[PDB]
């Protein structure tokens, strides 16, 4: 179920996949959860997204050492906001290779983030250019278009039923698309549907600010985004 580890929560989603969850006070909103992923690929571990802070991110690495006890080969982060990239220095201190959309790395300094070490670029159809994501194993990285942010990316996990929408996708009962201050309101719906179409077999949709849901998270998110146009 949920495993509490210090101030974080970890939940196994599949034999080789766990969700990490960390919390930060957003004055006016309460203590806000953010989710990312941990994937074992044979003898190594892959991380999707940091926690909000360096200290929390170091705790993710402590949990991995305790529960998996294999090296973390790389991390990929899914846009330049604090919940996704706030712990980059902890990853770098640990010697982990880090990857982000080129645009996320460009935006990182102005957003108050540390850039990843490596930049992903994307084909016109949204799929990552494979040479920019070497040794990603089962992580299949897709740029669905601008939506929650200009730079948001998404990740499928081959060999599982899981696709990770990050902060682009909200759950099937979500009331709003949330803060749209960095959003692309025109392109959001199409970007949500493009995520679904990229990972058509994924039955478990993981996202930053809701628990895992069915594909109704994608349809519901797109349908709410239809009203922004
Ligand atoms: C700090 C982040 C980055 S997505 C944020 O803006 N959040 C997290 C949940 C509340 C809120 C929002 O997306 O509206
Ligand atoms: Zn965000
Ligand atoms: Zn977020």
DSSP string, 94-105: TT-EEEEEHHHH
3-state secondary structure of 10: strand
Residue among 109, 222, 117, 129 nearest 174 (CA): 222
Query: Distance between CA atoms of 219 and 149, rounded to whole angstroms?
Result: 19
Instruction: Give the pairing type, strands 44-48 and 139-142.
Output: unpaired
Measured in Å, residue 76 CA sits from the centre of ligand 3 at: 15
3-state secondary structure of 76: strand
DSSP H/E element including 193: helix 188-198
> Has 79 been labeled as part of a binding site?
yes
3-state secondary structure of 218: helix
Measured in Å, residue 20 CA sits from the centre of ligand 3 at: 13
Dihedral angle of Cα 164, 16, 21, 130, to the nearest 10 degrees: -40
Query: Distance between CA atoms of 63 and 183, rounded to whole angstroms?
Result: 33
Declared resolution, Å: 1.1
Tokens found for residue 117: 């070490």
DSSP H/E element including 93: helix 88-93
Query: Distance between CA atoms of 1 and 13, rounded to whole angstroms?
Result: 9
> Has 187 been labeled as part of a binding site?
no
Measured in Å, residue 152 CA sits from the centre of ligand 2 at: 8
> Has 209 been labeled as part of a binding site?
yes
Pocket of ligand 1 (CB under 6 A): 29, 32, 81-83, 167, 178-179, 209
Domains along the chain with CATH numbers = 1-229 (3.60.15.10)
Residues ≥6 apart with Cβ < 8 Å to 122: 101, 128, 129, 143, 153
Tokens found for residue 97: 């290779």
């Amino acid at each position: 179920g949920d495993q509490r580890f210090g101030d974080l929560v970890f939940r196994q989603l599949a034999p080789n996949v766990w969700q990490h969850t960390s919390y930060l006070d957003m004055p006016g909103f309460g203590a806000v959860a953010s989710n990312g992923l941990i994937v074992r690929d044979g003898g190594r571990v892959l991380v999707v997204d940091t926690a909000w802070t360096d200290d929390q991110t170091a705790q993710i690495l402590n949990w991995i050492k305790q529960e998996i006890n294999l090296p973390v080969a790389l991390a990929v982060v899914t846009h330049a906001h604090q919940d996704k990239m706030g712990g980059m220095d902890a990853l770098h201190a640990a010697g982990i290779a880090t990857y982000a959309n080129a645009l996320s790395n460009q935006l990182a300094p102005q957003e108050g983030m540390v850039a990843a070490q490596h930049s992903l670029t994307f084909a016109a159809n949204g799929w990552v250019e494979p040479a920019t994501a070497p040794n990603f194993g089962p992580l299949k990285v897709f740029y669905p278009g601008p939506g929650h942010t200009s730079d948001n990316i998404t990740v499928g996990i081959d060999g599982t039923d899981i696709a990770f929408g990050g902060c682009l996708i909200k759950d099937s009962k979500a009331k709003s698309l949330g803060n749209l201050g960095d959003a692309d309101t025109e392109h959001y719906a199409a970007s949500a549907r493009a995520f679904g179409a990229a990972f058509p077999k994924a039955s478990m949709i993981v996202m930053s600010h809701s628990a895992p849901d069915s594909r109704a998270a994608i349809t519901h998110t797109a349908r709410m985004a239809d009203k922004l146009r």
